[PDB]
Amino acid sequence: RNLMIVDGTNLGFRFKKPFASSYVSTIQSLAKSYSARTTIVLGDKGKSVFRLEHLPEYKGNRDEKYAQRTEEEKALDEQFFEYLKDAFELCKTTFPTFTIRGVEADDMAAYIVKLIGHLYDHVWLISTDGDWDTLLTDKVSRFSFTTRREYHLRDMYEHHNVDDVEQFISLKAIMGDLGDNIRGVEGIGAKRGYNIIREFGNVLDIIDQLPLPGKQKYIQNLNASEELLFRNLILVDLPTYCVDAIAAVGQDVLDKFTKDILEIAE
Numbered sequence: 001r002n003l004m005i006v007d008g009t010n011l012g013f014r015f016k017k018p019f020a021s022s023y024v025s026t027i028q029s030l031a032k033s034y035s036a037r038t039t040i041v042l043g044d045k046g047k048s049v050f051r052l053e054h055l056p057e058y059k060g061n062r063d064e065k066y067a068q069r070t071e072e073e074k075a076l077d078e079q080f081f082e083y084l085k086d087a088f089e090l091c092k093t094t095f096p097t098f099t100i101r102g103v104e105a106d107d108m109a110a111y112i113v114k115l116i117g118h119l120y121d122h123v124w125l126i127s128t129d130g131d132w133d134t135l136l137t138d139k140v141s142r143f144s145f146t147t148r149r150e151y152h153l154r155d156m157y158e159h160h161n162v163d164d165v166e167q168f169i170s171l172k173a174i175m176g177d178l179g180d181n182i183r184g185v186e187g188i189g190a191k192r193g194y195n196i197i198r199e200f201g202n203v204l205d206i207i208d209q210l211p212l213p214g215k216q217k218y219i220q221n222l223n224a225s226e227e228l229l230f231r232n233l234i235l236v237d238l239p240t241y242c243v244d245a246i247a248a249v250g251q252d253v254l255d256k257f258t259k260d261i262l263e264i265a266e
């Protein structure tokens with residue numbers, strides 16, 4: 001009776017020897033565990049056109065690390081990606097399996113939840129990515145193979161130091177993301193960020209009130225950061241921008257994906 005959506009490239013890193021059969025078996029076990037009536041496997045192909053258009057430096061740190069690999073280190077990664085390609089090929093014989101050049105799996109997942117989540121009792125997201133918790137609701141949860149935790153909306157403070165999704169999204173916008181090369185406001189950690197949000201509202205409401213009262217240096221920093229906050233919200237507000245992120249590579253591509261997903265449902 002549930003929907004299960006797999007962050008498939010993310011799951012691939014469990015194995016990072018062909019692993020296609022093992023990969024598919026894992027997904028089957030998961031589908032059983034989570035009573036999945038429907039399982040959809042997603043993968044990352046290329047780079048996020050939507051986010052690179054807004055921030056050319058997006059994941060630039062990761063690109064730099066890839067560029068500094070030796071030829072032999074690179075060849076090994078290519079092998080992993082070949083085995084992963086084979087895993088997706090095999091997976092496609094068994095489950096609906098999607099990749100879209102220039103679109104992050106994150107955006108595809110967010111869109112699926114919005115489009116068909118209402119037809120299922122519960123939605124289970126299979127991802128180690130905390131970013132995916134921007135999708136949590138009373139009927140959408142996440143499972144992580146690295147931490148072994150099941151992530152629920154009711155436990156958002158335990159996991160993310162905020163009480164709800166709106167706050168989570170705003171906190172990410174304020175703090176940025178070191179891993180993905182998104183700059184944050186200097187001097188604002190999770191505590192101060194949560195406190196700011198609880199006082200002034202979400203990031204859009206914060207922007208509307210700049211400059212905010214307060215003599216502390218982090219407030220002065222925040223007051224100077226209108227542009228950064230607005231841009232960051234676009235980069236991190238996965239539910240708001242998922243449709244735009246897909247449409248970035250062509251409206252026709254989005255239309256095909258919609259058609260494909262609606263076919264799977266029902």
Ligand SMILES: [Cl-]
Pocket residue numbers: 137138139152153154155
């Ligand atoms: Cl909940």
Ligand SMILES: [Cl-]
Pocket residue numbers: 226227230
């Ligand atoms: Cl702006």
Ligand SMILES: [Mg+2]
Pocket residue numbers: 104105106129
């Ligand atoms: Mg991702």
Ligand SMILES: [Mg+2]
Pocket residue numbers: 106129131132
């Ligand atoms: Mg992500």
Ligand SMILES: [Mg+2]
Pocket residue numbers: 131177179180
């Ligand atoms: Mg992140």
